[PDB]
Amino acid sequence: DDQQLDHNFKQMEEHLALMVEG
Amino acid sequence: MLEREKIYQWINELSSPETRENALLELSKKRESVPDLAPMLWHSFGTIAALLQEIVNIYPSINPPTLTAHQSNRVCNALALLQCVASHPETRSAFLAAHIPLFLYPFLHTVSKTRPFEYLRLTSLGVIGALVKTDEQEVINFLLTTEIIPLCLRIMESGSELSKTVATFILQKILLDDTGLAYICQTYERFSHVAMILGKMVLQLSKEPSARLLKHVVRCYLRLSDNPRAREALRQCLPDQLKDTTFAQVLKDDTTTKRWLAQLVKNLQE
Numbered sequence: 001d002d003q004q005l006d007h008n009f010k011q012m013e014e015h016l017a018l019m020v021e022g
Numbered sequence: 023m024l025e026r027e028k029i030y031q032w033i034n035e036l037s038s039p040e041t042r043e044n045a046l047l048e049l050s051k052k053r054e055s056v057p058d059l060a061p062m063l064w065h066s067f068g069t070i071a072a073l074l075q076e077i078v079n080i081y082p083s084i085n086p087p088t089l090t091a092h093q094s095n096r097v098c099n100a101l102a103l104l105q106c107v108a109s110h111p112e113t114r115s116a117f118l119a120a121h122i123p124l125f126l127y128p129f130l131h132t133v134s135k136t137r138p139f140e141y142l143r144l145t146s147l148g149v150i151g152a153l154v155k156t157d158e159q160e161v162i163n164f165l166l167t168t169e170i171i172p173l174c175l176r177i178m179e180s181g182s183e184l185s186k187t188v189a190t191f192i193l194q195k196i197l198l199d200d201t202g203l204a205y206i207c208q209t210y211e212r213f214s215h216v217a218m219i220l221g222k223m224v225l226q227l228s229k230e231p232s233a234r235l236l237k238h239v240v241r242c243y244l245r246l247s248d249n250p251r252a253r254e255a256l257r258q259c260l261p262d263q264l265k266d267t268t269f270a271q272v273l274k275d276d277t278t279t280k281r282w283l284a285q286l287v288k289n290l291q292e
Contacts, residue, residue, distance in 0.1 A: 002137075005091040008098065009141045013184050015054075016148050019155065020191040020238065 033062055036072040043096060046076070050099035053106050060110030063103060070107075070120070076100035077125045087134040094138035101126070101145040108152035118164055123150060130173045133180075140182055147177065147188040154195035162199040171196065171206070175219045183232050186223070190238035197245040207249040217246070217259055224261040231272050237279045240264070244282050247289040257290055 029052065035045035053059060063069050080097045083089045104122060107113045129146040132139050150170065153161050165171075170192070177189040193216070196202035206212050223239050243264065246252040263269065264283060273280045 001095070002091045005095055005137055005141065008095055009137060009144070012098070012102075012141065012144055012148065016144065016151065016184060016188050017234070019148065019151055020187050020234070 029056060029059070029062070033066045033069055036066075037068050042072060042076070046096065046099035046103070050102040053102060059103075060107045061112045063107055064113045064116065070122075073100045073103055073107075074122070074125060081128060084128055084132060087132065087136070087139060089134075089136075089138040089142065091138055094141050098141055098145040101142075101149060105145070105149045105152045108149050109155070111156075114153070114156055114158070115160065118153070118161060123153065123164070123170075124168065126150070127168070127170075127173065130170075130177065140185070143177065144182065144185045144188065147185055147192065150192050151188050154192050157195070157198070159199060159201065162196055162202050165192075165196060166202065166205050171212075171216070175215065179219050179222055183235060187232070187235045187238060190223075190235060190242060194238050194241050194245065197242055203245060203249055203252075207246070207252045210255075213246075213252055213255060216242075217252075217255070221259065221261050224263050228263045228268050231269070233272050233276055233279070236269060236272065237276060237282075240279050240282045240286065244286045244289070247286055253289065260290060 029049070032045040032049050035041035036049075049059070049063075056062075063073075076097055077100060080089065080093060083093055104117075107117050108122070126146040126149055129142050132143060150165075154165070174189040174193050178186055178193065181189060197206060206216055220239055220242055223235070227236050227239065243256070243260070247256060265287065269283075273283070
């Protein structure tokens with residue numbers, strides 16, 4: 001669950017990383 | 023075919039709390055693979071209310087900061103679904119009229135540096151980010167009247183490398199709007215508050231660099247130089263690290279950021 005939190009965070013990181021890109 | 027049925031089932035499963043948790047998880051990851059997911063979420067009876075319930079249920083665990091990994095994972099799946107509702111053209115105006123961002127403002131007020139909180143703030147910022155990327159005046163005028171600029175600046179100053187990038191990106195998209203630039207430059211108080219944080223950021227960036235965060239800080243500074251009152255103020259307060267050879271190495275690869283900073287210095291000359 002805490003291992004999944006770190007994963008889901010990393011996924012959101014990557015997701016938002018592409019969003020700010022212009 | 024079968025793929026859609028699975029999605030429709032999960033949207034309907036969000037309505038009853040007994041299946042809401044799993045339906046959140048499945049939909050939050052299928053989010054990018056389904057293009058019309060947002061109007062499906064929007065026009066399904068009580069789906070938005072279910073997403074907003076997931077937000078309000080977590081309020082007692084925000085202050086005092088007792089939010090757990092599981093609690094954060096669950097609410098961030100709900101916030102992810104709102105992120106895509108914010109993005110979509112069919113649902114964006116309706117999402118704003120439904121004042122949905124106001125439910126996230128408590129989350130953005132949090133300071134706890136624990137990962138459940140890090141994730142909560144980042145996902146919440148992602149929703150505002152989704153709303154601004156649409157470059158809509160109505161979104162800007164909402165954001166200006168709701169006091170998001172203060173919330174962004176707090177995160178911008180003392181957040182995670184990425185949440186800082188996202189909050190700076192939200193400030194940038196406001197500044198890019200004529201009304202947004204006019205608002206921030208209207209009073210010395212407003213400008214001075216923004217410029218001070220932006221400057222503080224240049225100083226942390228000179229110690230611990232981030233080529234993507236610097237790209238947004240530079241765009242913010244460059245947009246402020248468009249307002250003459252801000253341009254004259256910036257002639258005095260612009261960080262020396264942006265004028266000299268500080269970031270020259272990190273910007274060997276970014277030719278666009280290199281161009282912006284070259285334009286900013288030229289704009290400030292006269």
